[PDB]
């Protein structure tokens, strides 16, 4: 899995330790190996939520599997979770997009995962 | 909704209150409250367009329905419009991907909609 | 098409034709002419690949078409080495989201391609 952070909260705010956890939690989220998930932090960004540029985040998860009606939810309620807790952002200022990927479609070491 | 643009283009060509701008002309085109409306804008980017690196921009929007065959080419329009006169980007080298969500695929406020 | 490459490898690491050669590459692969295709790379990312900050890359490729189970095994071969010569990154800690547009899903130059 792959999730995706883009934040206009600066990069000393992001502590340390919040790509380890965001691995951690994930992989226990998705049942997933942790040795298969991808974190991506990005903050600084130019942003605004609802016309305002209090701090906001807009999310991705890309899984193959595992992404569906109700799990959406514990991911949602986790993430935000993480995002309020160690980047103080309000649960509502912040867009998680999920997307199921066809195995077909996830490329990683010269091949795809079909 | 969300939009995401990508550029090359410095960041202190990008206008005062052009996400402002883009809140407010989405919330219009989309139908949706500005409330909704999320914009990121990431200049300063190492791009291409046709193998060339004249000002340029890769561009998203997603949202809960709102996407489809006549309104995606009024978002074009509307969007290459704000990008060639606010950014001086042509909108011969403006990609925009569309992508209608399903709603219990987007995570706000510690869960997702429906 | 549209290539794009997130990588925690430092902007001085990544080859000044390495955009251009991306572009060659991906237009003979996927049969479009160069001047369709455009390029991102962002460097000096915030990344985790299974836990470890070791080089990594998190990548995306759209096109309205030329993607498939197989196509898609080929650009992973093409992507993942040009990625481990030119920006140093071990295949295995490459992800390529693949994605097969809609004509009516992609904006450019005031329009969509529908
Ligand atoms: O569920 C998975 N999703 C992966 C994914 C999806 C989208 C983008 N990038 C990566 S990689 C993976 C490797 C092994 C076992 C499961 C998975
Ligand atoms: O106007 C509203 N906006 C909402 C929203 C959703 C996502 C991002 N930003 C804002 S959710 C909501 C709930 C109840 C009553 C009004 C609203
Ligand atoms: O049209 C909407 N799209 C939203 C969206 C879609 C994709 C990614 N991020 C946000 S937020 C929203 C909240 C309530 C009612 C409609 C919407
Ligand atoms: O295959 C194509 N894909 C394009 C694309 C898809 C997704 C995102 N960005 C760009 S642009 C294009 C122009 C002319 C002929 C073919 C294409």
Same mark, same amino acid.
């Given at each position: 899995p792959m999730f995706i952070v883009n934040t206009?909260?600066?990069?000393?705010?992001?502590?340390?330790?919040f790509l380890s956890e965001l691995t951690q939690q994930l992989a226990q989220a998705t @049942? /997933?190996?942790?040795?298969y998930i991808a974190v991506h932090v990005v903050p600084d960004q130019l942003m605004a939520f609802g016309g305002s540029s209090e701090p906001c985040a807009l999310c991705s998860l890309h899984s193959? @599997? /595992?992404?569906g009606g109700a799990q959406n939810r514990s991911y949602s309620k986790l993430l935000c979770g993480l995002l309020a807790e160690?980047?103080?952002?309000?649960?509502?200022?912040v867009y998680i997009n999920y997307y199921d990927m066809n195995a077909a479609n996830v490329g990683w070491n010269n091949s795809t995962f079909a």
């Open positions: 206009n909260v600066p990069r000393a705010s992001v502590p340390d330790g @049942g /997933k190996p942790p040795q193959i @599997g /595992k992404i160690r980047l103080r952002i309000s649960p509502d200022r």
